[PDB]
Structure 1
Amino acid sequence: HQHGVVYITENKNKTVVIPCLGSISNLNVSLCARYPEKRFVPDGNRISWDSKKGFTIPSYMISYAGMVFCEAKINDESYQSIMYIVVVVGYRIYDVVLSPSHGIELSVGEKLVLNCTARTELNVGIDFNWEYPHKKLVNRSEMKKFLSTLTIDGVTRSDQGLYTCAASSGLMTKKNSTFVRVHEKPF
């Protein structure tokens, strides 16, 4: 058959619900997780199941498992749901900053290397998007760090201008630019 998805929030302890839907009000349902294998059960307090909502459980309890699935045994037969894949994801970007931060004076022929750095929570993925006037790009403690490097090898005088770097967590975005003036070789 198929598989499903269940998203773990940036905030564990918050409850997640697996859409294991039923039809028998009193259905005694469990939830297996992997890997490694564990099985959970409602406790009335935090863990539950609802014919029309499904298995509800604190995301911190299954955050580790790549997959989970409801299960129930009635009569001589046990059946269980489709595999629900756990997706643990974050979206916060603390700050975007590049080096050099301040002003920049250069001259024709020189090389330039600008470093953009993302400071995010954990479980974060970052997409790097730049903005500027033959240019090469490359992408690579309770925090996560990301960095992109732009290089121009033999700058012309028309590389003078604003250089904005943008980092995206997927729902949050942050910029931080610098101006780059260029002149002719001195004397």
Structure 2
Amino acid sequence: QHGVVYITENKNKTVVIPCLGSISNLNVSLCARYPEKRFVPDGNRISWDSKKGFTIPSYMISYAGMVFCEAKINDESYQSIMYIVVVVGYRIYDVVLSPSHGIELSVGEKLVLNCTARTELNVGIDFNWEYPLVNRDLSEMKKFLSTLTIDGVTRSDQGLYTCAASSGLMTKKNSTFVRVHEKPF
């Protein structure tokens, strides 16, 4: 029994763990892991409301793995369930496959096309190709590569080649035209 809390790459936003309680004025704090820290209201930035929950701006915890609110009440101390902190991104700066310029090939000649996406961090990436293959991850900037490969290249493979990268809530693509000539002479 646990909760989940997402954060964007553009931090400095504000977040609310639903530590909802009845008592309009409790000595309630927000303990964290990891590393084991423990936060307290200050009016200005931090706060805990009885029926609103514990409040704090993202960048203040984006490093932690899980947070939970805890209240000191005399005898023993009682706490909420575990909320899991999760930083995620979406910014795809660009996608470009090597080579960018056209390609004139010869039948049977091995073809390898590197497709390269530069993203911010904590980005997940899905690759999708359009045309008539293996990919791996690699500044505050990530780079994923998707390499398409054919050996026995026929004349029919002479189509436009499209790589597209989707980060979740965004997508970019680049392309290149390739022609498969028959062995000359």
Q: TM-score range by the shorter chain?
A: over 0.9
The whole-number CA distance in structure 1 between the counterparts of 2:140 and 2:3 is: 30
Matching of residue 64 in structure 1 with residue 89 in structure 2: no
- Pick one of 116, 132, 138 that aligns with 2:134: 138
CA apart distance, 1:85: 0.2
CA apart distance, 1:89: 0.7
3-state DSSP of counterpart to 1:113: strand
Structure 1 ranges of 4+ moved more than 6 A: none
3-state DSSP of counterpart to 1:60: helix
CA apart distance, 1:96: 0.5
Taking structure 2 as the reference length, what is the TM-score of the superposition?
0.96
The whole-number CA distance in structure 2 between the counterparts of 1:178 and 1:53 is: 53
Give CA-to-partner distance per residue, 1:52-84, whole Å, 9 cap, x none.
Answer: 221111211111111000111223121100000
CA apart distance, 1:114: 0.2
The whole-number CA distance in structure 1 between the counterparts of 2:6 and 2:28 is: 21
Structure 1 vs Structure 2: percent identity of aligned residues?
Answer: 100
The whole-number CA distance in structure 1 between the counterparts of 2:72 and 2:34 is: 22
- Once structures 1 and 2 are overlaid, which stretch shifts more, 86-95 or 75-84? 75-84
3-state DSSP of counterpart to 2:42: coil
The whole-number CA distance in structure 1 between the counterparts of 2:98 and 2:112 is: 9
Taking structure 1 as the reference length, what is the TM-score of the superposition?
0.95
The whole-number CA distance in structure 1 between the counterparts of 2:114 and 2:93 is: 17
Question: Is contact 1:93-1:174 (8 Å) kept?
Answer: yes
Give CA-to-partner distance per residue, 1:127-179, whole Å, 9 cap, x none.
Answer: 1111111xxx1111121111010000110111010111011110000011111
Question: Is contact 1:7-1:16 (8 Å) kept?
Answer: no
Question: Is contact 1:33-1:65 (8 Å) kept?
Answer: yes
3-state DSSP of counterpart to 1:158: coil
The whole-number CA distance in structure 1 between the counterparts of 2:10 and 2:106 is: 49
Question: Is contact 1:68-1:86 (8 Å) kept?
Answer: yes
3-state DSSP of counterpart to 1:157: coil
Aligned residue-pair number:
183
3-state DSSP of counterpart to 2:156: helix
Residue in 1 that maps onto 2:176: 178
Question: Is contact 1:161-1:181 (8 Å) kept?
Answer: yes
Structure 2 stretches lacking a partner, 5+ long: none
